[PDB]
Amino acid sequence: MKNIRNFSIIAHIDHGKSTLSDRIIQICGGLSDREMEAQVLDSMDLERERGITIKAQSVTLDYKASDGETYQLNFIDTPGHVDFSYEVSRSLAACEGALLVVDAGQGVEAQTLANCYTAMEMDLEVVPVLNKIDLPAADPERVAEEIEDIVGIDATDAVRCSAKTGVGVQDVLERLVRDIPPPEGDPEGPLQALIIDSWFDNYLGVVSLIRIKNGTLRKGDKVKVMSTGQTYNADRLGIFTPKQVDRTELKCGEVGWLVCAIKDIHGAPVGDTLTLARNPAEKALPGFKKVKPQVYAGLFPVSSDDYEAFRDALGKLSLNDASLFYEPESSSALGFGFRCGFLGLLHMEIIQERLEREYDLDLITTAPTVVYEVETTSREVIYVDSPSKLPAVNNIYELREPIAECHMLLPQAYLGNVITLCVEKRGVQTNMVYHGNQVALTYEIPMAEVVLDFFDRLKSTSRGYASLDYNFKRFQASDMVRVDVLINGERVDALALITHRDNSQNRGRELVEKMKDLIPRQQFDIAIQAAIGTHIIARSTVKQL
């Protein structure tokens, strides 16, 4: 245990953290050849295409230090976003420290900051690393000041290194061992193993990556997954090198893989803890959950024949996505699809990109929105999931849309681009507090609008320095208006829209013109009209030939 060092790498760019990640492997295990980002360095297809880690594997290495001793380095790759805020914290919860790989030519950035802040909020040693010093545009001394200024971390003795040569990467490892404390626990205490990840191996079956917090796991041992309460036999276990080597036992403070014949990956959930059956730990390790989503959107196949594949693809994603929510939904116009919940914008964008490429699905995706509280003319309260079930306009006394309280953190320079979005999305400012050159904004925004991708638009307009947290607050009167169209008399639902009052008249006129372009002068007069309730707001009639 005294010789184990668990840590994760917070980096951007690439910054040379994941290529620091890569270079570390080269100077240790190897195993052989150091890979390149251009090469499929990260294993999954998603990572390959983007050329980013979405999430990597994690690696266990052995490093002989200058003191002549061998250190088991177990490191986890940290995905760099707050949509997976929970997942990130759980990886960091498995560490005693972290590396902050910063480009000497660029300087720090806000997606490497929130993970870095939470890393300090949990008592982890954060080692500053100045990367890519060989580049002509590298300014180490200045970037050192930036880390000390923005992050609040001491970087006077910050270790620096090259991506060209690999010089000083060993010194990064020397520092690591010196300053990150060894993992803690009782090798004899009741077994407590944190499930970091579980996947399916087409030959080995369900495999879990483990961190041992307490006790010792050996080959024969009958293990217990604490949530399910079921028991299993630890048939095989070992470490990654990254090569898969078996071991007789995983001891306290070590990271490795376990193969016991668990049915599916839900039988070994991420965050759960493994104890021994003969000697079960009294209390499961902290922070286990399922977890939940902010943002919602409907996804419908272009072709109804894709529906089968789409349903199965959601199921496939669901075995490994704990916070992905989906539920069946149908439209007259759009067809059979699924109403979907997401943690935020890039959670939605990852899944969409994955649905598009891996599962090869051409999909229609409606703009995101939320549920409502309706009071009938015959006074009473009903709740509407699906817009197709909303009472007739005449029967609505008051339509009440959910308001979300959005707590946002952002640097002062950006609030101009931020509150302009807020009010574009119908927000009302509730409070504003100053903290140095950082502003704490609290806004009340309609949930229907928070869910229809706005999270991305805030993250773009502030270049990822604004951090959103929203919860339900109230129902209120909506103040957005529903404009039908009926063409030749007949209701065309597919053509209906929800738009803000102030230009609902205007949006109605545009909808009629759009139609007039798609419908030529034909055999019979064709009347196209937009309407709110009983009231016609725009009518145009395509004269017959």
Partner: protein
């Protein structure tokens, strides 16, 4: 007589302070101790005068500490109460919402005399008249 210095200025209610929107973040950015000021201000403000918004100049030091000098107040409002009305005219001079005797004008001029630059009582009264004309309040002399 001296020279400008690092400090923030703001007009806060008599006996009440500490809210984020009004104060807090305002001087909080400078590194001011909101908790100390709110209690310190209202402390002497109660004795000085309550119910009247008083502008104070908070002077912060390198020790992020601070001091403040308390001062004085406004007009349209005095004519509204004197006239017995709640709001202005909306269309001044066009339609009169209320009226004020020249006697009251003088009174209000006496109250604001502290903030007014008028050399004499007649002058300050003339100034008060300008406020009335802008709020649709005629004066009966």
């Amino acid at each position: 007589a001296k020279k400008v210095q690092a400090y923030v200025k703001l007009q806060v209610a008599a006996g009440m302070a500490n809210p984020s929107p009004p104060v807090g973040p305002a001087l909080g950015q400078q590194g001011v101790n909101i908790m100390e000021f709110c209690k310190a201000f209202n402390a002497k403000t109660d004795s000085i005068e309550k119910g009247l918004p008083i502008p104070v100049v908070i002077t912060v030091y390198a020790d992020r500490s601070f001091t403040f000098v308390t001062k004085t107040p406004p007009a349209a409002v005095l004519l509204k109460k004197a006239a017995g009305i709640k709001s202005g005219s909306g269309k001044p001079n066009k339609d009169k919402v209320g009226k004020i005797s020249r006697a009251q004008l003088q009174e209000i001029a006496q109250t604001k005399a502290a903030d007014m630059t008028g050399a004499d009582i007649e002058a300050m009264t003339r100034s008060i008249e300008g406020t009335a004309r802008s709020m649709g309040l005629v004066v009966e002399d």
